[PDB]
Design a protein around this ligand. Structure first.
Ligand SMILES: [Cl-]
Ligand SMILES: [Cl-]
Ligand SMILES: [Cl-]
Lengths: 147, 164, 289, 776
């Protein structure tokens, strides 16, 4: 591996680069802030940046808030998601929402109403991971039974 | 419409010189560039060069970074339309009469190609014959043509780094 | 005869035979023709091939070879034809394909006879509204509709008010190439299209669609023959295939207050009307004053 | 000292470092010559003007090698005072070369002709016999009868013999629908045909062939439109606002039957957008920071009610007070009917950060380059890697006049590839009034941005890429733009008996030429001198010049490299005595279901002889005409208005070295019938008596609104046009607002507007009943 000093310097470079890929709506694009939104990767990078904060790395507050606002749109509005290359659109939409749900719940920011409504569509899941993520979210936010 | 090195050898004799042998067909003027390989880190050059027939334009940056250009000489020939091989007068080139391993990169005056004929050589009428053993190494210095000039003090044994 | 009969009922390195359904159907056709057997089965394979070639993006060398060998002899015959029909007292004749429009009186008693010395080819396309609304169905093509507000969020189809601008988003997919897909999106009577061809007198899609720039960019990439902003429908002529789904976006306005039935979005091929899709049945549209 | 290079021919220099071997070596195509040609291309011929660089204008020109696509010379000769040359022009011509032994000058026709975007060289391309295509409207509904009229005249609006004109009806898909041979009736062409109800919607057109095989087009929309029942006026301020000013729009709405939009709702959108094309007088010049953020926003949703006069005001406080770039506020306003159907219009308000701003125009082409960061191909100004990037910089006001400034921060920025924007080079520019600054920067590779900052803090920047071009070039996007020579004329219009006095106010001194041109060649082939600060010269307008595509042109050169400047101006020959004083007398207000009477009176001062004047009267609903802001067809402007510049200028001063049918509707389903009423009327062409008097009576049906009366008048050379507005309204108006259609099982709240337009109070009873597929 790297030296501890090299590894930490590289994480900081990566954060500053990732922040430049944040779009005006808080979502993330693949290369530029003007590019199209990447729904699963927004939850992925938001997971990375929140965890980075718990591990001693600085991420600006405005970027996290904008990101969390966008993750909340994913829980509330799966209908506005454009994933035209998806074979199982509902399964894709469900993986995005469940990931968005875990990242917000780990910050105590996921509304129980939204989680319960995503849970009603559990049959849409094509893997165990989104259901385990949603389960942890429901338990964390207060619904231990559905969790 | 081609011209290239015919011998592809590492040593041409100082005596019976006749320069470097080149086989040409319909090529009247040839621009040859000579480069003296830096004495330090010479084993690293030989391993990278691998005694090739031609030189690639992209790979030339890494290889010619450890060799300095001494002369830019064009040579007058007279073929119009047979693929006859001919000599290269090198005896008038004063920087080439100095010590060190050289590399000759030839090209047609105003021609631009992916690869140009190149050869690694040394101008010398000295002929050594070493003998390797488990602990020591006995070298036998001599001379080409009529004569066996055996005297040998001049033995530069360099390692992988390129130090005597 | 048992093997041949079984073959024409059996559907289709991996297999190692360099094959495909298209290639195998053309080779089977040449085999039947060559051995002058089952002429009725030959006509069935020829129609099936015509649709498969039409829906194929690119043909492999073996597919085009087989297709050429199966169809090289059909244009070598004259285009002359004769027919006696139910809708004509006089005989119908021609040297090329001649279309004849028909009404419901003519169609219910439609009968055609070959009065020629060669075989005649007939194509009959009938269209009209069913007596009741059919259920969403799809074959080869797929269509889905979604309505967004100009804020890029899903619009709540109850909280719609007289004057509101909405972005109607259509997504069309296909399991093969549909070079001539016709998207017909019949409007609810409360929604009026913002005619983009008459820019001075309407709201701009470009200006009011900044929050769905991804959808506008996807639409810009589609191969669109034409777009029509009619009184009762939005129409788009497009090319679609499996590797390239089509995104269409149009601007509409909530005008007359009322409770409106929502027609399902439709897409079908002109050449192959069996390549058809009707999108999901929507809730009633309420336009508030 | 290189003797073989002193010989004729085009050379190529390939340089390399003595013993260096690289993928690519610097190379350039050049010609050693102090000869400066300036060719002029025409429809049939090509006139070339030989000259010389430095102090001297060696005009002699025999040495003209015109080579084709294959590479063979076609013609070579000499002519005119001091030297000039006239040659035969070809459609697929490729080259032009100068001198046999005394050096070589290369000029290729394959390169784009000099961009005259800063010059008013726009007009109709009808240099040949004129065919004016006109009708009462340009907007039709499927199932309507298209009305088209025509008058054939020569290049100077004079009558010619009765000849047939072939008209083709073209669909939006480009296919022809029907072809006819139109014959004139009393010097008038008239074409009428019904659009099918299953007709395609879009831009249709009628193409005419007079015999020249150069088609004359008449465009018309075929759409499912609804005539507007209201007029909406949205007015901002002509002069741009400062970044501190509140943005205000004045709203005026009224029913076209003559009543204000009292209590009517206005819904709308306010948008903030950058104003990059801030000066219309400078086409191609960009203003403002392209690196600046939040310049594209949705400000607010407008919701207001108009007062009793049908008036309102839209305002928003500034949220861009610290902007260094020009911006614009767009109001997309929808004035709603009592039923909800809007009348939508757009108004724009310009915001300027200062009174004068810096503007940038790259001199290099814009090509479509794919960007995988946005996953979309976008046309962007590109230049070859390792080459210099040229730019035109101007400090202009809103009107286009260049102001004098000193201390412009011209900075070449290198944009981050994969830290922050690296400032590559810095400069200091001083500008003179009416001077275009020309900056050149050595560019390496990747993304770049050229920004210029004025001392008033106003910033302007243009983004450009440095790399490779895989063809896909925009049609003449890198064309040479010459420096402007402001040409002034003594009189507004001239005639065969007049004498023109032109003032050539060039930026500096310079020899060249001054001439009068047409699409068939020049008419004032030579004039050579220019001295001091301006030159007033006499041009005698010749009597045989019977056309309106006539223009004026000047060229000046001065060495320090010899900077070249061009001047172009239209020569107006349209006489006012050839215009008919057409007066229309109609009542200001009238009732529906009554006939309208139009009183025509044609005349002209001193003459007053309106001999056999023909008048074509038409009346169309204003709500139809307002959709496409339809202009009343003017025969005088058609036959005598400014025509386009018939020449193309080529010079080498820019390359000088310095150091079935209805089947889709069938699949969708039979559309419901729309019963809207389109009020259009066209009476037969009448003849005005000895006095120049006449009357047309047009029957008007059950219509409530405004009607535009239009008339076209003609003789052999005299042409006239006029318009009048007639309000058709009942004492009490009762109008029903309904959706465009209804589906089975739908419920709609219809609205009936009852308006009392009398001076007396009214007491009425409204009895309603529903028949057919409707029930109350
Ligand atoms: Cl065969
Ligand atoms: Cl078809
Ligand atoms: Cl309303």
């Amino acid at each position: 591996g790297d030296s501890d000093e090299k590894r930490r310097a590289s994480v900081d470079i990566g954060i500053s680069r990732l922040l430049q890929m944040q779009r005006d709506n808080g979502g993330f694009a693949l290369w530029d802030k003007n590019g199209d939104e990447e729904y699963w990767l927004t939850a992925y990078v938001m997971d990375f940046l929140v965890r980075a904060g718990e591990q001693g790395y600085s991420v600006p507050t405005d970027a996290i808030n904008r990101g969390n606002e966008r993750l909340l749109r994913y829980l509330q509005d799966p209908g506005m998601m454009s994933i035209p290359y998806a074979d199982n659109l509902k399964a894709s939409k469900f993986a995005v929402q469940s990931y968005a749900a875990l990242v917000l719940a780990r910050q105590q920011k996921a509304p129980l109403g939204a989680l319960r409504e995503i849970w009603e569509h559990r049959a849409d899941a094509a893997s165990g991971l989104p259901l385990l993520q949603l389960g942890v979210a429901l338990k964390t936010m207060g619904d231990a039974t559905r969790g | 419409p081609s011209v290239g090195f015919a011998s592809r050898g590492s040593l041409l004799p100082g005596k019976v010189v006749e320069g470097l042998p080149v086989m040409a067909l319909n090529v009247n003027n040839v621009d040859v560039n000579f480069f003296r390989v830096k004495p330090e880190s010479l084993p690293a050059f030989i391993s990278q060069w691998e005694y090739r027939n031609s030189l690639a334009n992209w790979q030339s940056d890494k290889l010619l970074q450890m060799a300095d250009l001494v002369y830019t000489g064009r040579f007058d020939l007279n073929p119009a339309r047979t693929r006859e091989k001919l000599l290269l007068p090198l005896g008038d080139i004063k920087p080439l009469q100095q010590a060190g391993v050289y590399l000759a990169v030839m090209n047609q005056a105003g021609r631009y190609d992916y690869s140009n004929p190149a050869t690694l050589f040394t101008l010398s009428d000295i002929g050594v014959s070493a003998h390797r053993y488990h602990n020591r190494l006995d070298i036998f210095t001599q001379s080409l043509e009529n004569g066996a000039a055996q005297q040998g003090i001049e033995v530069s044994l360099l390692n992988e780094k390129g130090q005597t | 005869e048992e093997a041949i009969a079984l073959a024409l009922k059996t559907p289709r390195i991996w297999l190692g035979d360099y094959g495909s359904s298209l290639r195998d159907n053309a080779l089977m056709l040449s085999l039947l023709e060559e051995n002058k057997l089952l002429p009725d089965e030959q006509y069935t394979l020829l129609n099936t091939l015509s649709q498969q070639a039409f829906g194929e993006r690119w043909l492999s060398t073996q597919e085009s070879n087989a297709l050429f060998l199966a169809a090289r002899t059909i244009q070598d015959l004259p285009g002359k034809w004769q027919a006696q029909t139910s809708f004509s007292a006089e005989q119908l004749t021609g040297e090329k394909a001649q279309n004849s429009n028909l009404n419901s009186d003519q169609l219910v008693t439609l009968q055609v006879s070959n009065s020629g010395d060669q075989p005649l080819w007939l194509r009959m396309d009938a269209s009209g509204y069913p007596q009741s609304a059919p259920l969403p169905a799809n074959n080869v093509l797929q269509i889905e509709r979604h309505i967004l507000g100009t804020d890029g969020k899903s619009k709540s189809l109850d909280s719609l008010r007289s004057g509101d601008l909405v972005l109607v988003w259509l997504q069309v997919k296909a399991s093969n190439s549909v070079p001539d897909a016709l998207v017909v999106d019949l409007l609810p009577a409360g929604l009026e299209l913002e005619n983009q061809n008459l820019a001075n007198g309407s709201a701009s899609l470009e200006q009011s669609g900044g929050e769905v720039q991804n959808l506008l960019n996807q639409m810009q990439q589609a191969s669109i023959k034409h777009i029509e902003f009619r009184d009762d429908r939005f129409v788009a002529a497009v090319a679609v295939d499996e590797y390239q789904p089509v995104t269409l976006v149009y601007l509409a306005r909530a005008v007359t207050p009322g409770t409106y039935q929502v027609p399902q979005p439709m897409v079908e091929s002109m050449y192959v009307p069996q390549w058809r899709a009707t999108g999901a049945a929507e809730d009633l549209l309420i336009v508030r004053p | 000292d290189i003797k073989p290079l002193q010989q004729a021919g085009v050379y190529l220099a390939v340089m390399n470092q003595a013993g260096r071997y690289d993928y690519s070596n610097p190379a350039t195509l050049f010609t050693l010559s102090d000869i400066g040609v300036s060719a002029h291309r025409y429809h049939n011929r090509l006139d070339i003007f030989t000259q010389s660089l430095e102090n001297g204008a060696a005009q002699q020109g025999i040495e003209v090698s015109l080579l084709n696509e294959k590479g063979q010379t076609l013609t070579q000769a000499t002519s005119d005072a001091q030297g000039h040359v006239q040659l035969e022009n070809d459609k697929n011509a490729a080259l032009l070369l100068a001198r046999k032994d005394g050096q070589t000058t290369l000029l290729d026709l394959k390169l784009p002709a000099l961009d005259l975007a800063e010059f008013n060289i726009a007009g109709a391309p009808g240099y040949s016999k004129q065919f004016f295509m006109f009708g009462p409207r340009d907007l039709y509904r499927p199932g309507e009868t298209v009305i088209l009229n025509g008058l054939l005249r020569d290049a100077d609006g004079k009558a010619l013999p009765n000849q047939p004109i072939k008209l083709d009806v073209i669909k939006p898909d480009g296919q022809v629908l029907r072809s006819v041979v139109s014959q004139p009736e009393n010097g008038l062409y008239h074409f009428t045909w019904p659009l099918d109800s299953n007709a395609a919607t879009g831009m249709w057109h009628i193409r005419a062939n007079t015999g020249d095989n150069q088609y004359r087009m008449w465009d018309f929309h075929v759409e499912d439109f609804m005539p507007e029942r209201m007029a909406l006026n949205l007015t901002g301020e002509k002069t741009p606002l400062t970044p501190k000013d509140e943005v205000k729009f004045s709203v005026v709405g009224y029913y076209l039957y003559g009543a204000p939009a009292n209590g009517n709702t206005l819904q709308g959108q306010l948008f903030l957008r950058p104003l990059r094309e801030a000066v219309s007088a400078l086409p191609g010049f960009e203003f403002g920071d392209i690196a600046a953020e939040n310049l594209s926003r949705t400000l607010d949703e407008v919701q207001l009610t108009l007062d009793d006069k049908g008036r309102g005001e839209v305002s928003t406080e500034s949220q861009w007070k610290e902007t260094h770039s020009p911006l614009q506020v767009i109001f997309q306003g929808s004035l709603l009917e009592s039923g909800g159907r809007p009348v939508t219009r757009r108004a724009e308000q310009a915001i300027w950060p200062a009174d004068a701003l810096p503007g940038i125009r790259p001199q290099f082409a814009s090509k479509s380059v794919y960007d995988y960061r946005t996953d979309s191909t976008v046309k962007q100004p590109i230049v070859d890697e390792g080459s210099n990037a040229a730019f035109d910089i101007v400090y202009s006001d809103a009107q286009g006049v260049k102001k004098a400034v000193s201390g412009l921060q011209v900075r070449l920025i290198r944009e981050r590839r994969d830290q922050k924007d690296l400032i590559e080079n810095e400069q200091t520019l001083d500008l003179k009034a009416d001077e275009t600054g020309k900056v050149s920067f050595p560019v390496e590779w990747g993304a770049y941005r050229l920004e210029v900052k004025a001392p008033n803090e106003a910033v302007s920047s243009v983004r450009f890429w440095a790399g490779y071009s895989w063809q896909d070039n925009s049609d003449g996007s890198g064309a040479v733009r010459p420096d402007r020579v402001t040409l002034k004329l003594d009189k507004a219009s001239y005639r065969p008996g007049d004498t023109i006095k032109l003032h050539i106010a060039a930026p500096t001194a310079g020899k060249g030429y001054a001439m009068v041109e047409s699409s068939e060649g020049p008419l004032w082939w030579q004039e050579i001198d220019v001295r001091a600060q301006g030159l007033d010269l006499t041009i005698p307008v010749d009597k045989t010049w019977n056309r309106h595509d006539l223009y004026l042109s000047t060229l000046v050169v001065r060495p320090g490299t010899p900077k070249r400047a061009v001047g172009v101006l239209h020569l107006p020959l349209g006489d006012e005595n050839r215009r008919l004083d057409l007066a229309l007398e109609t009542p200001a207000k009238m009732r529906p279901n009554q006939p309208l009477t139009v009183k025509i009176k044609a005349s002209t001062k001193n003459g007053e002889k309106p001999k056999q004047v023909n008048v074509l009267v038409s009346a169309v609903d204003s709500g139809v005409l307002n959709i496409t802001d339809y202009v009343t067809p003017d025969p005088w402007q058609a036959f005598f208005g400014q025509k386009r510049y018939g020449a193309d200028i080529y010079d080498i001063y820019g390359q000088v070295i310095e150091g079935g049918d209805g089947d889709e509707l069938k699949r969708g389903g039979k559309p419901p019938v729309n019963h809207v009423n389109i009020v259009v009327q066209q009476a037969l062409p009448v003849t005005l008596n000895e006095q120049g008097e006449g009357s047309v009576t047009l029957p008007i049906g059950d219509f409530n609104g405004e009607l535009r009366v239009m008339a076209q008048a003609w003789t052999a050379d005299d042409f006239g046009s006029n318009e009048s507005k007639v309000i058709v309204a009942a004492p009490v108006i009762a109008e029903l607002n309904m959706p465009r259609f209804m589906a089975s099982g739908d419920t709609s709240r219809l609205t009936l507007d009852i308006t009392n337009l009398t001076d007396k109070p009214q007491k009425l009873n409204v009895a309603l009943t529903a028949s057919g597929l409707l029930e109350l």
